UniProtKB/Swiss-Prot annotation, chain B:
Organism per entry: Enterobacteria phage T4
Name by which UniProt lists this protein: Major capsid protein
Assembly behavior: Homohexamer. Interacts with the portal protein. Interacts with the capsid vertex protein that forms pentamers. Interacts with hoc; one hoc molecule associates with each capsid hexamer. Interacts with soc; this interaction reinforces the capsid structure. A total of 960 subunits of the major capsid protein forms the 160 hexamers.
Job description of the protein: Major capsid protein that self-associates to form hexamers, building most of the capsid in association with pentons made of the capsid vertex protein and one dodecamer of the portal protein. The major capsid protein self-associates to form 160 hexamers, building most of the T=13 laevo capsid. Folding of major capsid protein requires the assistance of two chaperones, the host chaperone groL acting with the phage encoded gp23-specific chaperone, gp31. The capsid also contains two nonessential outer capsid proteins, Hoc and Soc, which decorate the capsid surface.
Shown chain mapped onto the complete sequence: 210 to 261 of 521
Domain of life: Viruses
Gene field: gp23
Swiss-Prot record, chains C, F, H:
Keyword Zinc-finger appears in the UniProt entry: no
Gene3D superfamilies cross-referenced by the UniProt entry: Small outer capsid protein Soc
The species this protein was found in: Enterobacteria phage T4
Function: Capsid decoration protein which helps to stabilize the capsid against extremes of pH and temperature. Once maturation and expansion of the capsid has occured, trimers of soc attach the interfaces between the hexamer of the major capsid protein. Acts as a 'glue' between neighboring hexameric capsomers. Dispensable for the head morphogenesis and phage infection.
Lineage: Viruses, Duplodnaviria, Heunggongvirae, Uroviricota, Caudoviricetes
Gene: soc
Record family assignment: Belongs to the Tevenvirinae Soc family.
Domain of life: Viruses
Annotated keywords: Capsid decoration protein, Capsid protein, Virion
Subunit structure: Homotrimer. Interacts with the major capsid protein; three soc molecules associate with each interface between the major capsid protein facets.
UniProt-annotated location(s): Virion
Any single Gene Ontology cellular-component annotation: viral capsid, decoration
Protein name, per record: Small outer capsid protein
Curated annotation (Swiss-Prot), chain D:
Organism: Enterobacteria phage T4
Post-translational modification: A proteolytic cleavage by the prohead core protein protease gives rise to the mature major capsid protein during virus maturation.
This protein's name: Major capsid protein
Full protein stretch here: 106 to 157 of 521
Lineage: Viruses, Duplodnaviria, Heunggongvirae, Uroviricota, Caudoviricetes
Similarity annotation: Belongs to the Tevenvirinae major capsid protein family.
Function: Major capsid protein that self-associates to form hexamers, building most of the capsid in association with pentons made of the capsid vertex protein and one dodecamer of the portal protein. The major capsid protein self-associates to form 160 hexamers, building most of the T=13 laevo capsid. Folding of major capsid protein requires the assistance of two chaperones, the host chaperone groL acting with the phage encoded gp23-specific chaperone, gp31. The capsid also contains two nonessential outer capsid proteins, Hoc and Soc, which decorate the capsid surface.
Coiled coil: none
Subunit: Homohexamer. Interacts with the portal protein. Interacts with the capsid vertex protein that forms pentamers. Interacts with hoc; one hoc molecule associates with each capsid hexamer. Interacts with soc; this interaction reinforces the capsid structure. A total of 960 subunits of the major capsid protein forms the 160 hexamers.
Length: 260, 52, 79, 52, 104, 79, 52, 79
């Protein structure tokens, strides 16, 4: 599947802009177009990871008296009777670790080894002692809590690569598994053509034009659902949809969080 | 003659003026505009013959 | 008057589909209003400046949203 | 005093200064209602803009 | 300044813009100065994080605060540790020598 | 259904001559049928893929010549 | 396809009207118009002639 | 709204003679109107800027001569 963007800018603007602000107008616009395309693409991948994720803290990962899908810091069951943040934040770590195990149970490839989460979740992780200790809390240390300098925040317990979803809609974390192979991720991004510039001008009025075009393709790992014994129709699309990835991808589990 | 008299009287007078820059930037349908072509020019090369 | 001049906009009739058309419209928009918001592009149109509205339908600066709606309306397709 | 360690200064040698600001705007018309900004820190890209 | 401890930085049971040390939601159920003072540090980082989210330039770099807030910070172990409180140490608490009172 | 999807074809109504027009039409053609034969090139048209026919008029794969007549028809100019 | 273009403008000398002590609005166009230059510019005087 | 702000003008009551006074007056003048023409000097007054007219009597920019007359009126003497 393709993507493309155009600039199509006027001459008089470039002339006046240079005269007054010193900007080129051509260079600025080509910069923007190429940049925008890559930003849009990266978001597409993240959205598919969450789209296809299973509901976490569900089924075999539930405490029977729980709310079925959300980790609530104000709920004494979810926080295991914990007090202050020093004992309570660790309860979230327990649910995270429990989710990672469930990912291994369903994928058969490995335990969740990365976390994509909201800024609030990461600040919670950064501000708590994640090792085994009575309790502890304080100013955030181990994980960047920013998004400005980097998306990658740090490694949780030396176990999970934590990234911040700078656009998290609510507040949540997704625990996911990624193997060493490009065939072991559940979600794939497979580029074919990228950022080929096209240039010209319309020979009636000579106004310059330009734009860029790409072609990628995405897909779902055979066995991503994992539970199914067999696919329908034998020869099937690997492109994600309602009938093949939504809420099914064994590589990911999304747990909502509340009470932070 | 009538036109010249009105010019003499200042009733109707000669004028010359360019295009707004915003009109010129849109000619020949740039950006969805319409019916706004550039004015154009060419040549005619003709001849005459003389017998003796 | 706006005393800031106007942007005079004229669209020309175009056919869109069977029994579907966009009629030409004539509007005049206070310059600072036009400048703040406009969506006229791709419309089969012409524009020009003036010291006074060139057209019978004029949008003054303090009309803000009447204009924004009026401009998007240049694309309305009717029978 | 707290001096000015918590603010910018930009001292003037003339009255009334001015500052410009640039926004990358998508959706054909850079100046429009609904003219979403490309690099605003609070908003993601319209992934379905260049695509479907 | 915008109201902090609001929207993304608001715990659902909190009061929107105020951190009350006697309120079990704000102090995360804590009991003891050695625990509740640290809870304030948590909220401070959440505010710093949002500044980065909205500005796109960086996390908050400074705090302007009342004497009471500074004494709370001054008297608590600000690192990640089990629990601790005592006499104020590394921050100015007076306002007769200077306004600047160290770095949190 | 074709079970291979459809090509959804829209021909935009256009004027050809004095009181002569090619009527706009929206049809769906079984993907393999469209691939087999089509005359939509230079036609003032737009197409897209779908899993099911997008339009009420559909040329199913087991039609061959009905679709061929239908293609010729998109070039037919009437009153 | 080929063509040429220019951009220039023609202005008016301040005080050319020589008929006011307070030009209306205090910031006004320096370009010629029906209202500010036609038949008014003190630097030039035109006389028609007849009978030569 | 001038959308250019207003100059808010207040005249304080003056005692001129036995049973002769200049009444106080509170008016708002569109900024560009004030900028174009005013006659306030030696008048026993105060002025200030605002976003919106501070007073119920406002001279909008499209007045010109009503405001000029209004300045002369700031010196009017009555019983």
């Amino acid at each position: 599947k393709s993507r493309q963007l155009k600039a199509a800018y006027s001459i008089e603007l470039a002339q006046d802009l240079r005269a007054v602000h010193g900007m080129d107008a051509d260079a600025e616009l080509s910069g923007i177009l190429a940049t925008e395309i890559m930003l849009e693409i990266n978001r597409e991948v993240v959205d598919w990871i969450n789209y296809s994720a299973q509901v976490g803290k569900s089924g075999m990962t539930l405490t029977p008296g729980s709310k079925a899908g959300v980790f609530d810091f104000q709920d004494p069951i979810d926080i295991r009777g914990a007090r202050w943040a020093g004992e309570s934040f660790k309860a979230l770590l327990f649910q995270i670790d429990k989710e990672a195990v469930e990912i291994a149970r369903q994928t058969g490839r490995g335990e969740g080894n990365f976390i994509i989460a909201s800024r609030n979740v990461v600040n919670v992780l950064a501000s708590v002692d994640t090792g085994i200790s009575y309790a502890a809390q304080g100013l955030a240390t181990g994980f960047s809590t920013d998004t400005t300098k980097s998306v990658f925040a740090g490694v949780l317990g030396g176990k999970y690569r934590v990234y911040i979803d700078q656009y998290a809609k609510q507040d949540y974390f997704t625990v996911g598994y990624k193997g060493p192979n490009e065939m072991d991720a559940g979600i794939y991004y497979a580029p074919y053509v990228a950022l080929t510039p096209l240039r010209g001008s319309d020979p009636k009025n000579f106004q310059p034009v330009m734009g860029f075009k790409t072609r990628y393709g995405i897909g779902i790992n055979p066995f991503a659902e994992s539970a199914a014994q067999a696919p329908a129709s034998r020869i099937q699309s690997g492109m994600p949809s309602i009938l093949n990835s939504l809420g099914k991808n064994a590589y990911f589990r999304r747990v909502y969080v509340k009470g932070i | 003659a009538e036109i010249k008299k009105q010019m003499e009287a200042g009733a109707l007078v000669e004028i010359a003026e360019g295009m707004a820059t915003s009109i010129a930037e849109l000619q020949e349908g740039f950006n969805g505009s319409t019916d706004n072509p550039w004015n154009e020019m060419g040549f005619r090369i003709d001849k005459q013959v003389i017998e003796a | 008057a706006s005393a800031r001049g106007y942007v005079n906009i004229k669209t020309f009739e175009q056919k869109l589909d069977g029994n579907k058309k966009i009629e030409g419209k004539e509007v005049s928009v206070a310059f600072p209003l036009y400048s703040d918001v406009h969506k006229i592009s791709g419309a089969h149109y012409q524009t020009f400046p003036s010291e006074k509205a060139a057209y019978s339908t004029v949008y003054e600066e303090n009309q803000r949203t009447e204009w924004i709606a009026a401009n998007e309306d240049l694309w309305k397709v009717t029978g | 005093l707290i001096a000015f360690d918590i603010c910018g200064v930009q001292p003037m040698n003339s009255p009334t200064g001015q500052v410009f600001a640039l926004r990358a705007v998508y959706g054909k018309d850079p100046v429009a209602a609904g003219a979403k900004e490309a690099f605003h820190p609070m908003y993601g890209p319209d992934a379905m803009f260049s695509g479907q």
